[PDB]
Motif scaffolding. Structure first.
Motif, mmCIF file in Angstrom:
data_model
loop_
_atom_site.group_PDB
_atom_site.id
_atom_site.type_symbol
_atom_site.label_atom_id
_atom_site.label_comp_id
_atom_site.label_asym_id
_atom_site.label_seq_id
_atom_site.Cartn_x
_atom_site.Cartn_y
_atom_site.Cartn_z
ATOM 1 N N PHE A 7 0.839 -1.189 0.000
ATOM 2 C CA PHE A 7 0.000 0.000 0.000
ATOM 3 C C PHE A 7 0.883 1.252 0.000
ATOM 4 C CE2 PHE A 7 -3.822 2.218 2.188
ATOM 5 C CZ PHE A 7 -4.244 2.697 0.969
ATOM 6 N N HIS A 104 -8.834 5.561 -0.254
ATOM 7 C CA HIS A 104 -7.809 4.727 -0.873
ATOM 8 C C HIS A 104 -7.838 3.321 -0.288
ATOM 9 C CE1 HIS A 104 -5.575 8.164 -2.736
ATOM 10 N NE2 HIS A 104 -6.240 8.811 -1.792
ATOM 11 N N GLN A 105 -7.565 2.328 -1.125
ATOM 12 C CA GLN A 105 -7.491 0.953 -0.664
ATOM 13 C C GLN A 105 -6.490 0.206 -1.526
ATOM 14 O OE1 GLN A 105 -11.309 -0.914 -0.204
ATOM 15 N NE2 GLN A 105 -10.441 -2.982 -0.057
ATOM 16 N N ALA A 127 -7.626 6.240 4.072
ATOM 17 C CA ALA A 127 -7.265 4.921 3.581
ATOM 18 C C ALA A 127 -8.014 3.877 4.383
ATOM 19 C CB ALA A 127 -5.774 4.706 3.721
ATOM 20 N N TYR A 128 -8.650 2.956 3.679
ATOM 21 C CA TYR A 128 -9.331 1.857 4.312
ATOM 22 C C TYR A 128 -8.449 0.634 4.267
ATOM 23 C CZ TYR A 128 -12.160 -2.207 5.082
ATOM 24 O OH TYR A 128 -12.600 -3.431 5.509
ATOM 25 N N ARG A 129 -8.464 -0.094 5.365
ATOM 26 C CA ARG A 129 -7.585 -1.216 5.548
ATOM 27 C C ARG A 129 -8.326 -2.269 6.348
ATOM 28 N NH1 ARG A 129 -1.843 1.303 6.887
ATOM 29 N NH2 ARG A 129 -1.244 -0.518 5.651
ATOM 30 N N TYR A 134 -9.318 2.813 9.474
ATOM 31 C CA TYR A 134 -9.021 3.900 8.557
ATOM 32 C C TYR A 134 -7.798 4.670 9.027
ATOM 33 C CZ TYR A 134 -13.793 3.176 6.853
ATOM 34 O OH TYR A 134 -14.949 2.635 6.329
#
Lengths: 141, 141
Positions: A7, A104-105, A127-129, A134
């Motif tokens: 990432f 974003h991912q 950003a997602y995770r 986040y």
């Protein structure tokens, strides 16, 4: 197709980098706060203001709630510090602040939650995770 | 998930914009040339150098060819100006120039074709679109 291996690499290609927030249920509001204000110290306020907006606009937000769960239960749980927040909270925050949130991912399409009907508004990046976590996404230079 | 309504919007969120190249079979080499050199005027040279590299590294590139099509036929066709180029040409160009090519696509995961085994190399950005068309992707400011 040909995927990024990390990432970090993906964001770096876009001139972006992660600013991690702690791995607890306050992560979304910390990440959004970081984007909005440059720090995450007002995350409790953002949680409360977001819930307030959801209640004020109940008819708009009841559709997001997983069925058989009362709207009151959903927002009451969300009001508690430490309760993980989801997409409906992003929509609420974005509409409350009249801005957009870009998500974003890793190796997934870039998403955009638009808080207005307008054409040129402020844009925040998160950003997602894994799980429901986040982080904030900031410019490198 | 929540998609961008236009490719322009998607790039703009990343501080990027399209630089269109003409809708003919030379588009990939024009786009790559634009990225490499700031203009597309050497697209014929890039096509020829890319084919030369593919031939020099035949064992690496035969695997890309659609079966029952002779490697010679594939590269002979690619050598002709106006012949649409595909992913194998991007790989060849990236390896020849020892750099990476990042590929943007509307509401699709960002792709990365890596020309080296290294960690920090030059990175070129193109956009894939309808048919076999590629454009250049540049910084806004």
């Amino acid at each position: 197709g040909p995927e990024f291996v990390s990432f970090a690499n993906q964001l770096q290609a876009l001139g972006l980098k992660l600013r991690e927030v702690p791995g607890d249920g306050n992560c979304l509001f910390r990440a959004l706060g970081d984007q909005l204000e440059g720090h995450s110290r007002n995350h409790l306020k953002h949680r409360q203001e977001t819930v307030d907006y959801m209640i004020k606009q109940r008819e708009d937000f009841e559709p997001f709630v997983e069925d058989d769960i009362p709207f009151e239960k959903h927002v009451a749980s969300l009001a508690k510090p430490g309760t993980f927040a989801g997409n409906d909270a992003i929509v609420a925050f974005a509409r409350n602040h009249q801005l957009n949130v870009v998500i974003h991912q890793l190796n997934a399409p870039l998403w955009q939650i638009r808080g207005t009907e307008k054409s040129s508004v402020r844009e925040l990046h998160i950003a997602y995770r894994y799980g429901e976590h986040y982080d904030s996404v900031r410019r490198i230079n």
